[PDB]
Structure 1
């Protein structure tokens, strides 16, 4: 309970799952959803569908606190990303905008073998 009205929605998509988050302007979260949350648990957490369900849950619960305008921010390139985004949009939540903020080092820590190989 708080009545935020205007906040931001952080979407974190990964090859393995998508967690969505809705904070308030200054940055503090209000509510969040995720593949797990919505019920899928395993290889399904990643599928776009889940992301859809997740993203919509992040909204429903968000709607509670009185949210109405989010500034969707994307991170990661996981499957079902440009998908979760399409959900928040068609959720009633006026999607102020979209931004890609996937972090990327300027050559930081040696990745693990899984993702190694320089060029």
Structure 2
């Protein structure tokens, strides 16, 4: 509705869910879409496919924003982390620079115990 012609694509590929938020280079959320919020839940929403079917739905918003091309901001493991890209890259959206913003602490915080079964 403002025609930005281009922005950036954020992907929060978590181990349980994946979400894609397209925003102008400034960092202002233009349009977002999440796997879970796309029907399938639990086991199904945490699959690679889920990210794709969900991601494509994000473009269904940030596209009518004049957007032509965009970058890639991937962080965290889990599926879709790679899938999400192809969706956009193939959704006509001209790609450009793929970057892995995945955080990596040089040893600072102590992770939680948990997981013990």
- Structure-1-length-normalised TM-score: 0.89
Quote the offset at 1:5 in angstroms.
1.0
Provide the residue aligned with 1:2 in structure 2: 2
Once the two structures are superposed, residues 7-39 of structure 1 have per-residue CA deviations (whole angstroms, 9 ceiling, x without a partner) of 000111011011001000111110000112222
Whether 1:74 and 2:60 are equivalent positions in the alignment is no
Provide the residue aligned with 1:43 in structure 2: 43
C-alpha separation in 2, matches of 1:37 and 1:70: 23
C-alpha separation in 2, matches of 1:100 and 1:2: 28
C-alpha separation in 1, matches of 2:114 and 2:86: 31
Whether 1:28 and 2:28 are equivalent positions in the alignment is yes
C-alpha separation in 2, matches of 1:113 and 1:6: 42
Provide the residue aligned with 2:63 in structure 1: 63
CA RMSD of aligned residues (A): 1.3
Q: Hey, which bits of structure 1, 4+ residues long, moved more than 6 A?
A: none
C-alpha separation in 2, matches of 1:96 and 1:59: 16
Quote the offset at 1:105 in angstroms.
0.9
Gapped regions of structure 1 (runs ≥ 5)? none
Number of residues paired by the alignment?
A: 115
Whether 1:112 and 2:83 are equivalent positions in the alignment is no
Question: Secondary structure of 2:36's partner?
Answer: coil
C-alpha separation in 2, matches of 1:41 and 1:67: 30
